[PDB]
Design a protein around this ligand. Structure first.
Ligand SMILES: CCCCCCCCCCCCCCCCCC(=O)OCC(COC(=O)CCCCCCCCCCCCCCCCC)OC(=O)CCCCCCCCCCCCCCCCC
Ligand code: HEA
Ligand code: HEA
Ligand SMILES: CCCCC/C=C\C/C=C\C/C=C\C/C=C\CCCC(=O)O[C@H](COC(=O)CCCCCCCCCCCCCCCCC)COP(=O)(O)OCCN
Ligand SMILES: CCCCC/C=C\C/C=C\C/C=C\C/C=C\CCCC(=O)O[C@H](COC(=O)CCCCCCCCCCCCCCCCC)COP(=O)(O)OCCN
Ligand SMILES: CCCCCC/C=C\CCCCCCCCCC(=O)O[C@H](COC(=O)CCCCCCCCCCCCCCC)COP(=O)(O)OC[C@@H](O)CO
Ligand SMILES: CCCCCC/C=C\CCCCCCCCCC(=O)O[C@H](COC(=O)CCCCCCCCCCCCCCC)COP(=O)(O)OC[C@@H](O)CO
Ligand SMILES: CCCCCC/C=C\CCCCCCCCCC(=O)O[C@H](COC(=O)CCCCCCCCCCCCCCC)COP(=O)(O)OC[C@@H](O)CO
Ligand SMILES: CCCCCCCCCCO[C@@H]1O[C@H](CO)[C@@H](O[C@H]2O[C@H](CO)[C@@H](O)[C@H](O)[C@H]2O)[C@H](O)[C@H]1O
Ligand SMILES: CCCCCCCCCCO[C@@H]1O[C@H](CO)[C@@H](O[C@H]2O[C@H](CO)[C@@H](O)[C@H](O)[C@H]2O)[C@H](O)[C@H]1O
Ligand SMILES: C[C@H](CCC(=O)O)[C@H]1CC[C@H]2[C@@H]3[C@H](O)C[C@@H]4C[C@H](O)CC[C@]4(C)[C@H]3C[C@H](O)[C@]12C
Ligand SMILES: C[C@H](CCC(=O)O)[C@H]1CC[C@H]2[C@@H]3[C@H](O)C[C@@H]4C[C@H](O)CC[C@]4(C)[C@H]3C[C@H](O)[C@]12C
Ligand SMILES: C[C@H](CCC(=O)O)[C@H]1CC[C@H]2[C@@H]3[C@H](O)C[C@@H]4C[C@H](O)CC[C@]4(C)[C@H]3C[C@H](O)[C@]12C
Ligand SMILES: C[C@H](CCC(=O)O)[C@H]1CC[C@H]2[C@@H]3[C@H](O)C[C@@H]4C[C@H](O)CC[C@]4(C)[C@H]3C[C@H](O)[C@]12C
Ligand code: CUA
Ligand SMILES: [Cu+2]
Ligand SMILES: [Mg+2]
Ligand code: NA
Ligand SMILES: [O-]
Ligand SMILES: [O]
Ligand SMILES: [Zn+2]
Lengths: 84, 58, 514, 46, 43, 78, 227, 96, 259
């Protein structure tokens, strides 16, 4: 395609700055609006002790060896189910 | 800020027979001797650790 | 001076020299591991103990011979020494990065040696297949040390590959086209391209193996929905290109040696030889699953990989016939190097023909994971790669050293090695059809005779390795300085004398555009 | 400037052939011996 | 290829010495380890 | 509809990998046995699936899939 | 089994292994043709004082030695692929047996009617009875009916193994979490030996396979005797 | 538009500057370009600049030849390619 | 004296200290993973950074200050960098292969479905879509940065480059955030494995690219770049587009399709 816009008169610095401020950052703004407006603590999923999840063939070499590195207690159960 | 690039050209083109990694003065020499010391020290330490792991412990 | 010259090098000849010294030493380590293999199998019963310590030795044998002997000598050694001298370049594009390629290898070797010291070592095979290579069947640091050794060597060869490609493309005389570079340079540029595309897939694979062993990933663990077969794809996607990598620089050296000792000004069918090497490079990326004909793939896949594997014979064949056509009408000098090159031409052909037998998925059922496969690959490696290395080494030793070898001694060495490698590997075809498996410390009584002859062959090869160390000593001890070299009008690398000065082509060559 | 010519472009001296024999011996010898010592070491733990 | 005569020629006797030392540097250590294999296993 | 010797050729599973053939017939059984209890009916309509799964599936797999159904950790949709 | 000083394949026990023998003969004939032609042409090039060191023109003979090889590869590919698709053919088997690799022994499951299963371990050398073969004998053989199409399914419960019987032209890898099928058809009764064909740890060399092929009647009573 | 970004003209130094200046005067002291051939006869030889007494010449005798003929050209009388006989004469020096 | 345009590099100790720092990092991970200890890893990481710092320092000394980067040298660096990017493409390909292998043929042990039973995938129209717009936007702003430099415009170059870096940092914080909020882990079987290793390598690449643009920023402040000679910035720009394109393939393959 050709997008739908218009230009191609000259691809110089003014044109790319126009796209930065006129299209690129406004897209970031919309997607930031849509995002922080659809998420507010998602109802935490029920713990079934499935064997193909919470895999522990070897303790992690940090902490108590049983916690992943970005462990979030609100949403990540240990193999024995959720903590506090 | 100001364009001091010409000052540095003069300094780094001085014909003093120093290699490029030493040509910016006393600091270059400090940073070099620290790098080379941590490397040689860390290597002796790793060979010692390797020696320690080659034997079992009960 | 020593430190500045030898630890801090930015000189392609000195780095080349470091590679040859490292390769030679690694070669001693690999020879000793190969005698331990044949000591164990030289009579019925158990010499060392279980298949674990045996397969530690068998695994180390392959890693040392492939990554620490053949690749450093052929690419790092001959490649750094000769490529700039053949294209009139003052050094490599990235001479400081080129030094790091070299210095990554001794650490890489230290880690692999450390892997056999700690625990029970890595008795995995050089394929390092899970789950045997996983954190239950190989608990502890041995396999992890092996993965890290392979990382450092892969980085070494990737950096080397970027250097060689950039040098051969960017640093020729302006008037010189790619179609005016000698075949050794073509051979190294195509090897470098295969390394660049193949090694990062290995790196991905063995990284996924590291995470399965240490971060509780299940890429290869069916418990987590993984598949051990995925590891085989990634490994062989690298693994088959790796064997073409191991032979291409040898094809290049053979083209040079056969041309020189025929007194020809150039090899027969130059553009056909470039065509064949590019075709071998390309076809070698689309055949990997011929290493996987017993894992349970669809018959239509098995038919594709059989057919595609076989087409490689056509371009390889063009190279063999072109070498013979270069001999045609030659003023043949029966030099030590020429003997190495002719042995290569015949023995690589036999190993390639047994490769074509194995290309057949139907037949590979019965020959897979037997000594038939071991015989195939020792024909193309012990008597292909290694023959090219010996031929190149005695040819160009005077260029590197300034000194000559004793030709009579060099011929005695070739004769001993020729008997030894054939007595070692020829009988192994029989062991394989008769169904003796790979990676066995001991065998049923029926297999005794061929294992005894094979093992005896390996002791003759040892005598040759020992005689070579003496032959090198004799040359440096006698100090016969080179005076005069033939055919310098078509062999630029000789044109700055023996040895060439530290800086060659400070003033570039002159070549007219016409 | 670095030294040029036969016996000068190598990190080892070739000035004396018996000192050279001694170096080459330790060099190639240490390499060939290593696997035998590694195997001995594995037998003396297990 | 042509060359000057040896600057420091190597006599037959000197080659015999050098070939002997070369061989013994390969065989003696291996032989020691291999000879004492059973003393190691009995452990 | 019997005289069962062993699981016949199934054109859905024509290749050397037969993992999915064991798996499909095991779901297919326990799905049928469930629907024939939930609609009060004849459980022996499901009998063929049981014969084929018992023929093809390793014991240890069947053991494990059964314990997991009991335990409520069985990942297949029944 | 293999016998002393054997050069070629174990005698065929199935139609497939027979068909492989004939294909190998075909292929090896060509391998001898090519390896001998190259050896002759080498000695040809090296046995004359006559010289011709000036340029030689390539694109005429370059044609010959591209096209001939191509025809030769079709002469190998055709038979190769016929056999390949014949080894996968729609079978209609009478029996399904499962083998499961383990460190370091095979277990076997006959579960068509009853839950028959047993472990199969190598006889140690010290426990061999006179005339029994070192490293090849198992305590519990795999009894199977002769002259019947059997479905063998191969998996493992730990690391990779490979289930091989050369005489019957069989090798199928044992992969945990996977069920690999092969088909087994003995033309004759007897004992037929195989060995673990994938590196699997300490005792990879010491976990062999023995088939006992007997008539259906004897197979039936053995099965019953084994529950 | 502001400025503030130096040019090569202003800020290029060492060999980069040398190559750049020399280029504007249509000259090639650092052999970046393929020299153009003469008739290569005794009276119109190929002129081969060198900063010393000798320089390696590569002669591509016929276009699309894959093999370059290599030889040392010395200060003195014109020399010929051993293969096609075209003439080359070493002219001097200066360059830098 | 030389009459070629190529750079004969001063003997340098950095190749050796890089090689040795590689030994210390790989030994160090072994000591961490097995003998619960980080000392060796800490030293190797330190010697690695000191080496990268002094090596690339000298390259700037050689180029900006000593004028060794003739057009010939510059052609070589272009090739070197394209070749390095190509090698990184093949690295990521292993991770795409692993993902497609697992997802197109879900094993019984997962429940014979993708996503696996028990896995609650992220919504691709939430933060994944915002991540996509942040990186695509940063490709527009770095293009503006490039054209500003070529036209000699110092202020707009720095402004565009600053926006580019801010968007790189934003993407990193959003992804850290997603990592923490996520209801699956790296240990949640092959779904977790493919997810965190593919995206985690990419994330590491975003950080390397951001660092490179920041180095470019400080160099621009100090007037290193001419309107015609700025290969450091070209390489940073090519690397950044690579990081962008790899995210698109991750977004389409893992976030959208494999959910
Ligand atoms: C040339 C190589 C290097 C030279 C250096 C010396 C060493 C190299 C050896 C080199 C001497 C070659 C001798 C040929 C082997 C003859 C066996 C055979 O008929 O093979 C038949 C089959 C199957 O056998 C059968 O099913 C039926 C056999 C019938 C057996 C019944 C009686 C047994 C007779 C006793 C034999 C005792 C064993 C003696 C066998 C010798 C033991 C060492 O075996 C096989 O497939 C094995 C084939 C292996 C494939 C490798 C390719 C070889 C081609 C290149 C060689 C150059 C030839 C060029 C043209 C010819 C010119 C050479
Ligand atoms: C340098 C090393 C090298 C080279 C060059 C080759 C070359 C070839 N190899 Fe080999 N191979 C290995 C090293 C090598 N190999 C290794 C190490 C393994 C084992 C991996 C492991 O450890 O498991 C192996 C394994 C291996 C297998 C797997 C077997 C198994 O594990 O069951 C197969 C199957 O196709 C194979 C095929 C081939 C083919 C078709 C060629 C072709 O390239 C050969 C082509 C050459 C010729 C054909 C001769 C010259 C041609 C002519 C004279 C023309 C006329 C010929 C005809 C018309 C036929 N190889
Ligand atoms: C290039 C690679 C290479 C080379 C050269 C060799 C050489 C030898 N190999 Fe090896 N081998 C492998 C790669 C190699 N091998 C691989 C990949 C496997 C499979 C591993 C596995 O199953 O996991 C294997 C497997 C293997 C087995 C099977 C193990 C088993 O299944 O149990 C055996 C048994 O005999 C064996 C023996 C030998 C012998 C006797 C030599 C002898 O020929 C050795 C003689 C010595 C030399 C050829 C070295 C001489 C050259 C130098 C010393 C360089 C000097 C250079 C200068 C001075 C510049 N090898
Ligand atoms: C499921 C669907 C499946 C469908 C599959 C079908 C097809 C796939 C899609 C595409 C591929 C199709 C064919 C490719 C084949 C060949 C194309 C040949 C084009 C070409 O080669 O043309 C060249 C390059 O064109 C160029 O980049 C382009 C130059 C463009 C100039 C004119 C553009 C005017 C358009 C409007 C301008 C829009 C403004 C853009 C800026 C805003 C952004 C939104 C010409 O270069 P040149 O003369 O040096 O110009 C220099 C002047 N500055
Ligand atoms: C913003 C994103 C970027 C983060 C960067 C900052 C810090 C993290 C540290 C390391 C990341 C670097 C490299 C990537 C390697 C592995 C993938 C890790 C990706 C990751 O960070 O994934 C996390 C896992 O980290 C874990 O456990 C593992 C923790 C890390 C352990 C270190 C791993 C080191 C080994 C890697 C091998 C290196 C070999 C490379 C080869 C080089 C080329 C040859 C996910 O968190 P979780 O709690 O499981 O699930 C979230 C739960 N809500
Ligand atoms: C824990 C797991 C193990 C990790 C092992 C890590 C290995 C080594 C760590 C130490 C490496 C860091 C030190 C910096 C390396 C600098 C490379 C470089 O920047 O080399 C440059 C050229 O390559 C170019 O352009 C483009 C090439 C850029 C190469 C990038 C260098 C980093 C190496 C990483 C390689 C990863 C490969 C990815 C696939 C696995 C410069 O060439 P020089 O010869 O220097 O001089 C040339 C002069 O003319 C310049 O004035
Ligand atoms: C790249 C540009 C050119 C286009 C490439 C096209 C070729 C291949 C990719 C597309 C192929 C997908 C086709 C899928 C259709 C079938 C789905 C499937 O399921 O295939 C699966 C494999 O797919 C998989 O991972 C496939 C994984 C990919 C492996 C191939 C690796 C190639 C990498 C090199 C490319 C480098 C270039 C970089 C591009 C930017 C598994 O096989 P099955 O046999 O089903 O397993 C179950 C059996 O029991 C059934 O008997
Ligand atoms: C926990 C966190 C761990 C993270 C560790 C890693 C961290 C940071 C690495 C960041 C990368 C920074 C690289 C900066 C290089 C600066 C030197 C430079 O840019 O040098 C330039 C040349 O480029 C050149 O060599 C080319 C230089 C190419 C370098 C690009 C390589 C990137 C390497 C990444 C490797 C890792 C890959 C991932 C593997 C896991 C100099 O030429 P010009 O600019 O034209 O200037 C000259 C003008 O002034 C003349 O008037
Ligand atoms: C190719 C490049 C490869 C780069 C590899 C980078 C090396 C990996 C970085 C590891 O970073 C460390 O991880 C530790 C994890 O062990 C953290 O502390 C840990 O240690 C404490 C106890 O051990 C725990 O309580 C903490 O929660 C836990 O985060 C520690 O802060 C952090 O700096
Ligand atoms: C594959 C590589 C192997 C190649 C074959 C090596 C051939 C052997 C030659 C060197 O071996 C020596 O042999 C002696 C045995 O004759 C050993 O001495 C041992 O044997 C003697 C008694 O027989 C004692 O006197 C010694 O003290 C005792 O240590 C000695 O240690 C060993 O070095
Ligand atoms: C030039 C040489 C490098 C030697 C080498 O690479 O092997 C120098 C550079 C810095 C030196 C080191 C540091 O300057 C000082 C350290 C303290 C003592 O002076 C000796 C050890 C010590 C650790 C030094 C050893 C050696 O003399 C080094 C490493
Ligand atoms: C082996 C590989 C799958 C890797 C994996 O399972 O992860 C698959 C993916 C795509 C496959 C190919 C494509 O499906 C296209 C071809 C289909 C033909 O039926 C077989 C050859 C054929 C060329 C295939 C061979 C092989 O099975 C490929 C290459
Ligand atoms: C045309 C091209 C290069 C010519 C040149 O510019 O020198 C040549 C080089 C090698 C040639 C090929 C090789 O000689 C191999 C093949 C030989 C057959 O006779 C024709 C097809 C064949 C595949 C050739 C086609 C074509 O003539 C090639 C590809
Ligand atoms: C200091 C410099 C002016 C040129 C000069 O140094 O001589 C100006 C020009 C562009 C400026 C930057 C860019 O405008 C981007 C940023 C703009 C925001 O207002 C925050 C400061 C911000 C990060 C600026 C910092 C600083 O004032 C810069 C770098
Ligand atoms: Cu089981 Cu080998
Ligand atoms: Cu292959
Ligand atoms: Mg196998
Ligand atoms: Na034995
Ligand atoms: O291969
Ligand atoms: O191969
Ligand atoms: Zn000429």
């Amino acid at each position: 395609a050709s997008a739908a816009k218009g230009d191609h008169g000259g691809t110089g610095a003014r044109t790319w700055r126009f796209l930065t401020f006129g299209l690129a950052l406004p897209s970031v703004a919309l997607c930031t609006l849509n995002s922080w407006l659809h998420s507010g603590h998602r109802e935490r999923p029920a713990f079934i002790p499935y064997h193909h999840l919470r895999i522990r063939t070897k303790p992690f070499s940090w902490g108590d060896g049983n916690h992943t590195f970005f462990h979030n207690p609100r949403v990540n159960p240990l193999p024995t189910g959720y903590e506090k | 800020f100001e364009n001091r690039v010409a000052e540095k050209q003069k300094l780094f083109q001085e014909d003093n027979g120093l290699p490029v990694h030493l040509k910016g003065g006393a600091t270059d020499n400090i940073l070099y001797r620290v790098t080379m010391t941590l490397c040689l020290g860390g290597t002796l330490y790793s060979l010692y650790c390797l020696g320690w792991a080659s034997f079992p412990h009960k | 001076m020593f430190i500045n010259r030898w630890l801090f090098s930015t000189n392609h000849k000195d780095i080349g020299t470091l590679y040859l010294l490292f390769g030679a030493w690694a070669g001693m380590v690999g020879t000793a591991l190969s005698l331990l293999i044949r000591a164990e199998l030289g009579q019925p019963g158990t010499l060392l103990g279980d298949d674990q310590i045996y397969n530690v030795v068998v695994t180390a044998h392959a890693f040392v011979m492939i990554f620490f002997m053949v690749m450093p000598i052929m690419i790092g050694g001959f490649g750094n020494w000769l490529v700039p001298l053949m294209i009139g370049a003052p050094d490599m594009a990235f001479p400081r990065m080129n030094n790091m390629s070299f210095w990554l290898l001794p650490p890489s070797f230290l880690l692999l040696l450390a892997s056999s010291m700690v625990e029970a070592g890595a008795g995995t095979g050089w394929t390092v297949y899970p789950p045997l290579a996983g954190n239950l069947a190989h608990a502890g640091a041995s396999v992890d040390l092996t993965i890290f050794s392979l990382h450092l060597a892969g980085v070494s060869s990737i950096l080397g590959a970027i250097n060689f490609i950039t040098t051969i493309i960017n640093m020729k005389p302006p008037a010189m086209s790619q179609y005016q570079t000698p075949l050794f340079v073509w051979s190294v540029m195509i090897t470098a391209v295969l390394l660049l595309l193949s090694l990062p897939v290995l790196a991905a694979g063995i990284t996924m193996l590291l995470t399965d062993r240490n971060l509780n990933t299940t890429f290869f663990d069916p418990a987590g929905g993984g598949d051990p077969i995925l590891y085989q794809h990634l490994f062989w996607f690298f693994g088959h290109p790796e064997v073409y990598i191991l032979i291409l620089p040898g094809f290049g050296m053979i083209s040079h040696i056969v041309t020189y000792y025929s007194g020809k000004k150039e090899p027969f069918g130059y553009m056909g030889m470039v065509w064949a090497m590019m075709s071998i490079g390309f076809l070698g990326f689309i055949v990997w699953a011929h290493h996987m004909f017993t894992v349970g793939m669809d018959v239509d896949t098995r038919a594709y990989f059989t057919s595609a594997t076989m087409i490689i014979a056509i371009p390889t064949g063009v190279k063999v016939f072109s070498w013979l056509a270069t001999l045609h009408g030659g003023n043949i000098k029966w030099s030590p190097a020429m003997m190495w090159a002719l042995g290569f031409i015949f023995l690589f052909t036999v190993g390639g023909l047994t490769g074509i037998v194995l290309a057949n998925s139907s037949l590979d059922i019965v020959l897979h994971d037997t000594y038939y496969v071991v015989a195939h690959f020792h024909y193309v490696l012990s008597m292909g790669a290694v023959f090219a290395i010996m031929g190149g080494f005695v040819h160009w030793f005077p260029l590197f050293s300034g000194y000559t070898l004793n030709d009579t001694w060099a011929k005695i060495h070739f004769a001993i090695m020729f008997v030894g490698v054939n007595m070692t590997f020829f009988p192994q075809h029989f062991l394989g059809l008769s169904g003796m498996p790979r990676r066995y410390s001991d065998y049923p009584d029926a297999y005794t005779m061929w294992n005894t002859i094979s093992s005896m062959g390996s002791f003759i090869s040892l005598t040759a390795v020992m005689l070579m160390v003496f032959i090198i000593w004799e040359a440096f001890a006698s100090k016969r300085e080179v005076l005069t070299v033939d055919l310098t009008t078509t062999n630029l690398e000789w044109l700055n004398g023996c040895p060439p000065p530290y800086h060659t082509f400070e003033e570039p060559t002159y070549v007219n555009l016409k | 400037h670095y030294e040029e010519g036969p016996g000068k472009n190598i990190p080892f001296s070739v000035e004396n052939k018996w000192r050279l024999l001694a170096m080459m011996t330790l060099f190639f010898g240490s390499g060939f011996a290593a696997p035998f010592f590694i195997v001995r070491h594995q037998l003396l733990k297990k | 290829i042509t060359a000057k005569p040896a600057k420091t020629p190597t006599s037959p006797k000197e080659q015999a010495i050098g070939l002997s030392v070369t061989f013994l540097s390969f065989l003696l250590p291996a032989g020691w380890v291999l000879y004492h294999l059973d003393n190691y296993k009995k452990s | 509809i019997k005289n069962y010797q062993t699981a016949p050729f199934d054109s859905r599973f024509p290749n050397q990998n037969q993992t999915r053939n064991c798996w499909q017939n095991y779901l297919d059984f326990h799905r049928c046995e469930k629907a024939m209890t939930a609609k009060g009916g004849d459980v022996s309509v499901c009998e063929w699936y049981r014969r084929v799964y018992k023929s093809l599936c390793p014991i240890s797999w069947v053991s494990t899939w059964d314990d997991r159904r009991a335990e409520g950790t069985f990942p297949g949709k029944i | 089994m293999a016998y002393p000083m054997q050069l070629g394949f174990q005698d065929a026990t199935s139609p497939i292994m027979e068909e492989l023998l004939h294909f190998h003969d075909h292929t090896l004939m060509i391998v001898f043709l090519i390896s001998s032609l190259v050896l002759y042409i080498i000695s040809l090039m090296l046995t004359t004082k006559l010289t011709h060191t000036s340029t030689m023109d390539a694109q005429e003979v370059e044609t010959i030695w591209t096209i001939l090889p191509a025809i030769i590869l079709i002469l190998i590919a055709l038979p190769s692929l016929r056999i390949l698709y014949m080894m996968d053919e729609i079978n209609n088997p009478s029996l399904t047996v499962k083998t499961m690799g383990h460190q370091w022994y095979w277990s076997y499951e006959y579960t068509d009617y009853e839950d028959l299963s047993f472990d199969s371990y190598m006889i140690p050398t010290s426990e061999l009875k006179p005339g029994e073969l070192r490293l090849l004998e198992v305590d519990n053989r795999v009894v199977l009916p002769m002259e019947m199409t059997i479905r063998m399914l191969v998996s493992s419960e730990d690391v990779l193994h490979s289930w091989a019987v050369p005489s019957l032209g069989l090798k199928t890898d044992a992969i945990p979490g996977r069920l690999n099928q092969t088909t087994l058809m003995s033309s004759r009764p007897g004992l037929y030996y195989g060995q673990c064909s994938e590196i699997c740890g300490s005792n990879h060399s010491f976990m062999p396979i023995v088939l006992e092929l007997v008539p259906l009647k004897y197979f039936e009573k053995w099965s019953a005797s084994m529950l | 538009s502001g400025g503030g970004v130096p040019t090569d003209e202003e800020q290029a130094t060492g060999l980069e500057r040398e190559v750049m200046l020399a280029a504007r005067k249509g000259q090639d002291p650092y052999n970046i370009l393929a020299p153009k051939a003469t008739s290569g006869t005794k009276e119109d030889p190929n002129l081969v600049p060198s900063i010393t007494n000798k320089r390696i010449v590569g002669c591509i005798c016929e276009e699309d030849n894959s093999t370059v003929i290599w030889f040392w050209l010395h200060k003195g009388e014109a020399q010929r390619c051993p293969s096609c006989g075209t003439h080359y004469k070493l002219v001097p020096h200066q360059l830098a | 004296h030389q009459t070629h345009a190529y750079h004969m590099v001063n003997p340098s100790p950095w190749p050796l200290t890089g090689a040795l720092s590689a030994l210390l990092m790989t030994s160090g991970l072994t000591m961490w993973f097995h003998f619960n200890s980080m000392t060796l890893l800490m030293i190797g990481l330190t010697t690695n950074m000191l080496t990268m710092y002094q090596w690339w320092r000298d390259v700037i000394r050689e180029s900006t200050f000593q004028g060794h980067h003739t057009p010939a040298v510059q052609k070589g660096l272009r090739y070197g960098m394209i070749l390095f990017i190509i090698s990184e493409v093949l690295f990521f390909t292993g991770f795409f292969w692993a993902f497609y292998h697992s997802s197109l043929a879900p094993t019984p042990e997962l429940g014979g479905c993708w996503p696996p039973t028990g896995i609650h995938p992220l919504n691709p129209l939430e933060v994944p879509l915002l991540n996509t717009s942040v990186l695509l936007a940063s490709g527009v702003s770095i293009t503006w940065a490039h054209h500003s430099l070529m036209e000699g415009d110092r202020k707009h170059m720095l402004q565009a480059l600053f926006i580019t870096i801010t968007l790189g940092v934003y993407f990193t914080l959003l992804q850290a955030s997603e990592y923490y909020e996520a209801p699956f882990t790296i240990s949640d079987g092959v779904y977790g494995s493919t997810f965190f290793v593919a995206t985690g390598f990419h994330g590491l690449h975003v950080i390397i690219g951001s660092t490179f643009l920041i180095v470019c920023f400080f160099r621009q402040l100090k007037f290193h770049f001419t309107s015609n000679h700025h290969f450091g910035f070209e390489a940073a720009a090519w690397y950044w587009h690579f990081v962008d394109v790899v995210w698109l393939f991750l977004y389409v393959s893992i976030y959208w399709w494999g959910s």
